[PDB]
Write a protein that binds this ligand. Structure first.
Ligand SMILES: *[C@@H]1O[C@H](CO)[C@@H](O[C@@H]2O[C@H](CO)[C@@H](O[C@@H]3O[C@H](CO[C@H]4O[C@H](CO)[C@@H](O)[C@H](O[C@H]5O[C@H](CO)[C@@H](O)[C@H](O)[C@@H]5O)[C@@H]4O)[C@@H](O)[C@H](O[C@H]4O[C@H](CO)[C@@H](O)[C@H](O)[C@@H]4O[C@H]4O[C@H](CO)[C@@H](O)[C@H](O)[C@@H]4O)[C@@H]3O)[C@H](O)[C@H]2NC(C)=O)[C@H](O)[C@H]1NC(C)=O
Ligand SMILES: *[C@@H]1O[C@H](CO)[C@@H](O[C@@H]2O[C@H](CO)[C@@H](O[C@@H]3O[C@H](CO)[C@@H](O)[C@H](O[C@H]4O[C@H](CO)[C@@H](O)[C@H](O)[C@@H]4O)[C@@H]3O)[C@H](O)[C@H]2NC(C)=O)[C@H](O)[C@H]1NC(C)=O
Ligand SMILES: *[C@@H]1O[C@H](CO)[C@@H](O[C@@H]2O[C@H](CO)[C@@H](O[C@@H]3O[C@H](CO)[C@@H](O)[C@H](O)[C@@H]3O)[C@H](O)[C@H]2NC(C)=O)[C@H](O)[C@H]1NC(C)=O
Ligand SMILES: *[C@@H]1O[C@H](CO)[C@@H](O[C@@H]2O[C@H](CO)[C@@H](O[C@@H]3O[C@H](CO)[C@@H](O)[C@H](O)[C@@H]3O)[C@H](O)[C@H]2NC(C)=O)[C@H](O)[C@H]1NC(C)=O
Ligand SMILES: *[C@@H]1O[C@H](CO)[C@@H](O[C@@H]2O[C@H](CO)[C@@H](O)[C@H](O)[C@H]2NC(C)=O)[C@H](O)[C@H]1NC(C)=O
Ligand SMILES: *[C@@H]1O[C@H](CO)[C@@H](O[C@@H]2O[C@H](CO)[C@@H](O)[C@H](O)[C@H]2NC(C)=O)[C@H](O)[C@H]1NC(C)=O
Lengths: 319, 296, 299, 319, 296
């Protein structure tokens, strides 16, 4: 029953509306990020969804004790009665604290004065994805830790562990992308109001090529089969020849309307559309040689044009 | 230790139901908007999305002091107990106030008595466009804001810096896909209501479409059809019914261009520019096809 | 600091959980609204969204104060410490008030005891199921409210002006149809807990035919002319006329589905599927005649 | 005036967390539901949205008063200062109280002590959807009213008014389904913890056949044409007759895409899909055997078996 | 009358923010669940749904009393005052604590000092499904939950009844439509964290895909197409254009059905068994066109 009087001594006389070590030096805040999972990437809304432990720690004079030897894990509702930093995320769109039983707020106190505050939060952060080249992607999806109402002479940030402040990157299993590297960058960013610390957790996303590369082969094999249908046959039964070239536009249409819901209406550069242009202009070239009718010469010229086409595609892929 | 007594001195009888200057002059509100990223524009819902740092500031004579420091960067829990203006967006649809470890509200008192109060908000608003230039139109999305319960004889809005230099895109705050942000234009304005006359700060964002694949993916399957129309009328040395079935594809391509356009724009009553732009391309087809069907 | 004294004198002995006129007065309340926008009638949920400025006015024998102040303006912070009458919307699916940036709650108190109050509300209300004539649309779209707790013997709603008290000044406000007029209606509905007055507000609309003009023209200017050139072509070749007729009904099928794709299915006919089915069965009868002519030419 | 000090003594000395007759007889609770609308019966998510005027009433000797012969409707800021029963719904997913001007929370008091409580609740309740027979299937989706933390020795539920406790059901209109009957069940459920009462409100939903017969009759003309063109064309250009029946296979594929967009994957096979796939296999095999080998036999075989398939389909459909 | 006078004696001196222990015995909580239902799996975004009752029980010596009856039932209002552990799910990405007229939380205080505290929940947890065999899926979906701030030296979770047999209860109501509940397997573990060491209660749900949902939906059209692949071998040697045109008309539907089978299928880099089934169908197509071009 000794601990209750000490906690009441710590609370009676405390002001939540002041930062610790007030009127003096800036206080440091150490962060730690435990990425649970990249929850949901969305190429429609130019964004992704992340679930992580955001842990942070600092030091104060207002909370110190000497009687209790061990550390003091305390209830989460004392966070409404203790000072915390106003750390936010810049590129977010919709975020929340998980409240499945309570607010997941880890409050741990030390006899020194080291105060620990932990959250399990899910953030839907935007990522400026450049969709110019589709097979290779190499994104840079940032995650901008930044204070809100404290200037750089009032606060400073640091990674608690350097590279060791970020834990759990290798345990991420994404069905659509793959991590190749992650980077933690500190940066001082000024505004009209003032200067602010800004940590950045960035990482690249190499797309898992197998799913879309098995979706890519089907129009190519389809149009090679269509070329071999329209090429080898004699044209006395010309209705057998022309009905092959009739139904090519619906085959192009199915793949185009399937991809049009996946990728948005970005006008700039679409590499899938460049590939489908190399396909459908080749469809028009096959029909052009048909209306020009040399059939065996066009049949031999079709595979070497397909080979130079997907060689151009492969060198566009490997850059 | 001393600052606790200081802040307790500033609440001995302080009220929040009264603006500073009742029975006195009106209140002066400096206002600044620092946008972060101009988001996506839902043309199907004629609304856009934008992330702002909404700064606003006002002098309050009830809070002067002679303390050791001049400006104290207080917490927003103090700002919940202070008077604030009732600013709101006149055309906002679903606006969110971002909440985190603390709510994204700031407060900086001054020994003069002047304040500073910014809110990291995300506001979406309807941008009522017209489709008279539906391929390559350009519009000015509005953003109107002002008081709700305080008349022009109660509060007065004014931009903080010069109005040419008071809405700032950060460096590259562009979540835009279809459009190109180029400029902006603010102004004041007094709107008479059934209650009174409220002052309104109005801001227009001028934006114009990228030409791009919105023209390419619509004109190149039309380019293949108009090339097939020239290929059909080239010669007649070969068989004639090889040409007639060539019309049939140009039927179904008219299907594919029909579905590809309607999924972006809302169902409007008035016809647009791109609809006639593809209607003339449709009219180029079946006239020559009926002509060849009559003569052959 | 005079108003600080006056308003704090208006706090003790005043319960914020009671209506003022518990006695013989039935607490009549005037009301109005200013329609800011009427959003899209999506018709999949058969609902429509609408933004209004909704305002109420009543009296009190417990808030009369002294002179030298005609009316005092209040923020959104005295609404919890003052009794407010209930108002709830009947056909509201999700009527969420706007709470952004110190929320929209305007309040005024005169010396007489008259209290003005207002809000800023968006509604997604049900309108009707009017699918008799699909081009000839005429929806009334009622909007109605009552007190959820207080009956007609304890609360009374009243307008400010007979049938034209609702201000509405806009031209482009997400209306894909044509708004033609509005009116009010005051009724009393017998419920189980009591009897409650209902203040119905209609919004007369009519669908502009220009939206369905593109949906009607381009199938009509394709299928009918394809059926015409199926007969106008030389019928000596079997893969010309029958093939054109059989690909025409292949094209004519999916446009009926896409024309009924954005809007949900109904039980009764809407006289639009009947409007396209006549031409569909006409091209089908052209197919029947073409198949009949084949039986007596290949002898 | 005089009423305020009577309300004050009802608020003074009251304990919220103690039920009436705590340690005595079980309290008696009468409930009432008023269906406002059946909003959307989502077959894919297997749920329905219900708007309801939920209503409770009970007895409390602590909340009576001597004089003032009238009923005291209060503000909704007394329900947080009074006891309410913890009545939840079992199979809900998204449920909330509407907050239009305030929380729609009616408190009505009485001079004897009968407390009336009322809410306006929208509930997205899930129900079992057996999709073996698709037309005229009584889905029998229910709503399960149940208390949470009071054993049957502490509470008593009943329908307030008998069978007339459920109103407004005849005033409901659906574009797809139709009310045929509703029923109230009052049972007891034993858990590991204890015994709890349960009310259950059922809804058997006769689906209106008009949308169903439209989406049935629109593809039936296609297989009718598939029979007729196969019976009607001479077999010199036999590929010109067979290729139309193979385009009916992709017509079936478009119908199957509409089916997959309209229905999920279910182990118990439906009643709509089976006759269309059965007549599909028959009209394909008829074209196959016609191209296998003939003009009169095509006129004789296909319409008779077609009408036979029609009448056996109708006889399965009428059940 | 009497119980209010003793609940104030229970609340007198009981700190609402401290667990029993702290230089004393390790706090033990007894954990029980009750699966109300098991919601549908969402294979596109690779998650599932569950809604359960979640029970907890522990002893607090600072809550014993001497009353007339044995156990004492309370509301959720008093339950917000007694210290409860921070039990969170490791796999839940979006969860709701349901409330309707009250928070769905009861508090049963025994006279011995123990108490029961349960809540009705709903968890949208996910499973890392491997997709090497989509009709032959066999998955063990985890439902890990532990403490959030209290160390293994602070609290330890323990199942109430028989762990491997009767600590988890399926209540025979499942709204599933693609899978079926084979069984369950609880587990205990210790996860070494960057903060400290924490107990972990694991529960796996063994699931296999039903056979009549999509398996027949793929099995019927592929058999239809391989039947249509045989007629070209049935064709005459004097009927050479029909054997050519049969193959393209076969693949027109094969491509659309492959698109439809990959439509509801989520994205995976690993190959699926039905991807090899459509490959066998395409190989039959390739053999048919080889036998066609042999004549040609
Ligand atoms: C099941 O559990 C959930 C989770 O707790 C409950 O949801 C919460 O319910 C409470 C009680 O109703 C809400 O608290 C109240 O919130 C008022 C405004 O808060 C707004 O917060 C944010 C913006 O800051 C919005 O997003 C919220 O909107 C959400 O909720 C609405 C409700 O319908 C939804 O429709 C939306 O879609 C959002 O989901 C809220 O609008 C707040 O003003 C109020 O506080 C006043 O009253 C209390 C008690 O008197 C005191 O704290 C205090 O007096 C406050 O009064 C001050 O301010 C007023 C302003 O007018 C002044 O007049 C006063 O003088 C004084 O200065 C209260 O805190 C909470 O917002 C809500 N949370 C969410 C996420 O929904 C469910 O209700 C619950 N279900 C049950 C019980 O059935
Ligand atoms: C944005 O995030 C902030 C994070 O701090 C959040 O502020 C917190 O809100 C909660 C309520 O939502 C506050 O909790 C209250 O604290 C007071 C203090 O005395 C209590 O009296 C209140 O008790 C009420 O609710 C209890 C719930 O069990 C019941 O006992 C009873 O019904 C009481 O009426 C209540 O617990 C908390 O203090 C703040 N923290 C601050 C301001 O630092 C804010 O709500 C978030 N805004 C959103 C989500 O819009
Ligand atoms: C995503 O893009 C950002 C910027 O476009 C990249 O940030 C940049 O990272 C490099 C490497 O750390 C920084 O270079 C060096 O930074 C240190 C620390 O500040 C500095 O001392 C050196 O002089 C040098 O500048 C660079 O400054 C930084 N730029 C910015 C604007 O922050 C980031 O690395 C990219 N992430 C991925 C995964 O590609
Ligand atoms: C289909 O709907 C019916 C009602 O529309 C429901 O079945 C009901 O189930 C309850 C319990 O599950 C039973 O009610 C019993 O009634 C008897 C006689 O009144 C009573 O003595 C029992 O104590 C019990 O209350 C009964 O099986 C049945 N009741 C009725 C009136 O049909 C349920 O919603 C659905 N049932 C099925 C089998 O799908
Ligand atoms: C209280 O918490 C502190 C902070 O982590 C602990 O101090 C560290 O404990 C780790 C345990 O592996 C050691 O490796 C570090 O060397 C310690 N650092 C310092 C500066 O002491 C401390 O051990 C905890 N005490 C208790 C009783 O749990
Ligand atoms: C207050 O409410 C009670 C409860 O309904 C009313 O008592 C009943 O009222 C109905 C219709 O008014 C009639 O059945 C009887 O007058 C009452 N029946 C019983 C069994 O009490 C009461 O009338 C209401 N008070 C007033 C003033 O109307």
């Amino acid at each position: 029953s000794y601990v209750k009087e000490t906690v009441d001594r710590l609370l009676k006389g405390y002001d939540i509306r002041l930062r610790p070590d007030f009127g003096g030096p800036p206080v440091d805040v150490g962060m730690r990020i435990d990425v649970a999972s990249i929850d949901m990437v969305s190429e429609v809304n130019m964004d992704y969804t992340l679930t992580m432990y955001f842990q942070q720690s600092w030091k104060d004079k207002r909370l110190s004790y000497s009687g209790i030897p061990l550390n003091l894990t305390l209830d989460n509702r004392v966070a409404d009665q203790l000072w915390v930093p106003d750390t936010y995320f810049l590129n977010d769109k919709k975020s929340f604290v998980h409240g499945v039983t309570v607010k997941n707020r880890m409050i741990r106190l030390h006899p020194d004065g080291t105060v620990l505050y932990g959250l399990r939060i899910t953030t839907t952060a935007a990522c400026m994805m450049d969709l110019r080249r589709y097979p290779l992607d190499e994104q840079n999806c940032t995650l901008e830790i930044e204070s809100y109402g404290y200037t750089t002479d009032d606060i400073e940030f640091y990674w608690n562990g350097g590279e060791g402040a970020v834990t759990g990157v290798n345990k991420i299993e994404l069905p659509q992308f793959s991590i190749v590297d992650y980077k933690m960058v500190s940066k001082k960013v000024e505004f009209t109001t003032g200067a602010y610390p800004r940590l950045s957790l960035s990482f690249r996303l190499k797309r898992n090529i197998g799913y879309f590369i098995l979706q890519t082969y089907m129009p190519s094999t389809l149009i090679t089969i269509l070329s071999w249908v329209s090429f080898w046959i004699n044209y006395d039964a010309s209705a057998a020849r022309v009905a092959l070239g009739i139904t090519t536009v619906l085959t192009m249409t199915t793949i185009s309307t399937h991809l049009r819901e996946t990728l948005p209406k970005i006008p700039y550069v679409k590499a899938i559309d460049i590939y489908l242009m190399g396909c459908f202009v080749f469809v028009f070239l096959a029909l052009l040689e048909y209306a020009f009718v040399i059939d065996k010469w066009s049949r031999m010229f079709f595979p070497i044009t397909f080979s130079l086409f997907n060689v151009v595609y492969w060198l566009y892929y490997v850059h | 230790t001393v600052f606790t007594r200081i802040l307790d001195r500033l609440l001995d009888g302080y009220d929040n139901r009264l603006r500073p200057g009742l029975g006195e002059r009106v209140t002066e509100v400096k206002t600044d908007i620092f946008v972060t990223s101009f988001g996506p524009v839902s043309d199907h819902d004629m609304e856009y999305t934008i992330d702002v740092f909404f700064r606003q500031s006002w002098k309050d004579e009830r809070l002067k002091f002679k303390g050791p420091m001049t400006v104290l960067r207080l917490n927003n829990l103090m700002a919940s107990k202070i008077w604030t203006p009732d600013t709101f967006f006149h055309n906002g649809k679903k606006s969110v106030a971002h909440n985190m470890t603390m709510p994204n509200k700031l407060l900086r008192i001054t020994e003069d008595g002047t304040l500073l109060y910014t809110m990291r908000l995300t506001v979406r608003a309807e941008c009522p466009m017209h489709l008279e230039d539906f391929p390559m139109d350009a519009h000015a999305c509005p953003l109107k804001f002002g008081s709700y319960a305080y008349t022009r004889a109660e509060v007065v809005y004014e931009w903080t810096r010069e109005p040419a230099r008071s809405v700032v895109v950060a460096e590259d705050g562009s979540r835009l896909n279809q459009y190109d942000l180029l400029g902006q234009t603010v102004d004041s304005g007094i709107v008479q209501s059934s209650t009174g006359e409220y002052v309104v700060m109005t801001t227009h964002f001028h934006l114009k479409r990228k030409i791009g694949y919105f023209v390419i993916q619509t004109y190149l399957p039309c380019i293949m059809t108009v090339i097939l129309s020239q290929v059909s009328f080239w010669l007649n040395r070969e068989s004639v019914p090889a040409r007639t079935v060539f019309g049939v594809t140009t039927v179904l391509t008219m299907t594919t261009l029909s579905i590809s356009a309607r999924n972006s724009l809302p169902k409007v009553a008035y016809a647009t520019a791109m609809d006639w732009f593809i209607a003339v391309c449709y009219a180029f087809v079946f006239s020559a096809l009926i002509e060849f069907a009559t003569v052959n | 600091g005079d108003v600080t004294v006056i308003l704090n004198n208006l706090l003790e002995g005043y319960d914020n959980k009671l209506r003022p006129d518990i006695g013989v007065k039935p607490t009549l309340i005037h009301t109005d609204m200013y329609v800011n926008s009427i959003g899209p009638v999506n018709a999949i949920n058969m609902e429509y969204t609408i933004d209004i400025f909704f305002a109420q006015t009543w009296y009190d024998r417990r808030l009369k104060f002294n002179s030298t102040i005609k009316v005092l303006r209040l923020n959104s912070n005295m609404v919890g410490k003052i009794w407010i009458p209930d108002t709830f919307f009947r056909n509201s699916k999700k009527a969420d008030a706007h709470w952004i940036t110190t929320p929209n709650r305007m309040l005024r108190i005169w010396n007489d005891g008259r209290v003005l109050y207002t809000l800023r509300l968006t509604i997604d209300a049900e309108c009707q199921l009017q699918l008799h004539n699909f081009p000839m649309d005429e929806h009334s779209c009622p909007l109605e409210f009552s007190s959820y707790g207080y009956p007609r013997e304890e609360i009374v709603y009243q307008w400010k002006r007979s049938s034209v008290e609702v201000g509405d000044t806009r031209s482009w406000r997400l209306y894909q149809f044509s708004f033609v007029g509005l009116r009010n209606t005051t009724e009393v509905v017998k419920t189980t807990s009591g009897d409650y007055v209902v203040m119905s507000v209609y919004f007369d609309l009519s669908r502009r035919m220009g939206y369905f003009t593109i949906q009607t023209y381009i199938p009509c200017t394709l299928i009918v002319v394809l059926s015409w050139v199926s007969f106008w072509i030389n019928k000596d070749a079997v893969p010309a006329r029958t093939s054109l007729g059989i690909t025409t009904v292949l094209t004519m099928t999916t446009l009926s589905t896409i024309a009924r794709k954005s809007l949900p299915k109904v039980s009764y006919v809407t006289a639009m599927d009947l409007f396209v089915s006549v031409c569909f069965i006409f091209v089908f009868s052209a197919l029947v005649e073409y198949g009949t002519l084949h039986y007596f030419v290949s002898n």
